[PDB]
């Protein structure tokens, strides 16, 4: 050969393994796709200066490294680790501003949908992710370093850097890997004129999120579908205790105004055409005005006609 | 087992099929790419990894279909 180095290889930052390498072939041919200090050095020749440092591996995992991969991230797709490492490097160029102690993502590479997702997740109290990598990146996000959490949710949501995406889709994909740390219930009364009446109960995080409606009045409205027997089946909410309610629907025009003092506390907005590239804006209701957090910029208005997607309501206390 | 997907189409499915398997049989019918498919059941967005049994998808269940933005 010429020179021999021994690098340590990890997929979780905790467990490592030593790999003896040459200066006669690249990292990819000897070891595989490796990242060093947030940079893909797979196609470079190992230098003696990079002797005893740590590398983050993305493919060619050993049997125990796939076990460590699943224990940290869960059952992920074969391209997950390479996409997450690539996203984590490109997200480093972004900037997370904190205006009056609320975080917002500056606009870059059409990341406005990530701004609505992050700023909505910041309001969800008593949530915790059941995937360790997500929870680890979530704590670092709530501590001042969001690049890990931004890149992770883009990897789980299969988002492409620089391409616009769906904020409502990613928000619920992210929440699918989370649980609530407090009591929450919702009871749907189902009944068919043949089979009879039957109650179903959802507890925890699933009792705080609904996709389809955007107002509380539409949530408790009676719904009709087909029963298992083939007949008409009805459904209606008859009990609802929750710390907060997230209602998501397709972009719908509404005149959000501070005249009637609306009951919801925050909502997302999709500006532009749906078939074309649009711009997402996160909004909160502080004091007596609407605070439009438009990707680093802040605005205030008493009224606003906008296409609302997600709406966030306070705690629910309801029964009938 | 027969289910319905929202216009309304009907699919012959098994309770062990994954959501990605359901999105696959929707692309063969309507032609929508599975990445652009958002399936909603009881207000819950369905994940590709889980099966119809996890969401308790039973006979004659209705799945709502939303396109990924931008469409
Ligand atoms: Cl994945
Ligand atoms: Cl905040
Ligand atoms: Cl960042
Ligand atoms: Cl009855
Ligand atoms: Zn019935």
Author numbering:
A (entry chain A): 1481 to 1800
B (entry chain B): 1 to 6, 11 to 75
Please share text taken word for word from the publication where this structure appeared.
To reveal the molecular basis for the inhibition of MERS-CoV PLpro by UbVs, crystal structures of the enzyme were determined bound to ME.2 or ME.4. Both UbVs bound in nearly identical orientations as Ub.wt with interface surface areas of ~1000 Å2. Substitutions common to both ME.4 and ME.2 at positions 46, 64 and 70 were found to promote more favorable hydrophobic interactions with the enzyme relative to Ub.wt. In comparison to Ub.wt residue Val70, UbV residue Ile70 extends further into a hydrophobic pocket of PLpro formed by residues Thr1730* and Val1691* (asterisks denote amino acid numbering of MERS-CoV polyprotein). UbV residue Phe46 inserts into a hydrophobic pocket formed by PLpro residues Trp1668*, Glu1670*, Val1680*, Leu1682*, Tyr1690* and Tyr1705*, and forms a cation-π interaction with Arg1715*. The UbVs also differ in their C-terminal residues at positions 74, 75 and 77. In ME.4, Asn74 extends into the active site and forms a hydrogen bonding network with Asp1645* and Gly1758*, which mimics hydrogen bonds formed by the same region of MERS-CoV PLpro with Ub.wt residues Arg74, Gly75 and Gly76. In ME.2, Pro74 cannot form an analogous hydrogen bonding network, which likely contributes to the decreased inhibitory potency of ME.2 compared to ME.4. Instead, Pro74 and the C-terminal tail are excluded from the active site and the main-chains interact through a hydrogen bond formed between the main-chain amide nitrogen of Arg75 and the backbone carbonyl of Glu1754*. A structural comparison of the C-terminal regions of ME.2 and ME.4 near the PLpro active site is shown in S4 Fig. Additional substitutions in the N-terminal region of ME.4 and ME.2 (region 1) do not make favourable contacts with MERS-CoV PLpro, and in fact, residues 8–10 and 7–10 of ME.4 and ME.2, respectively, failed to resolve in electron density maps.
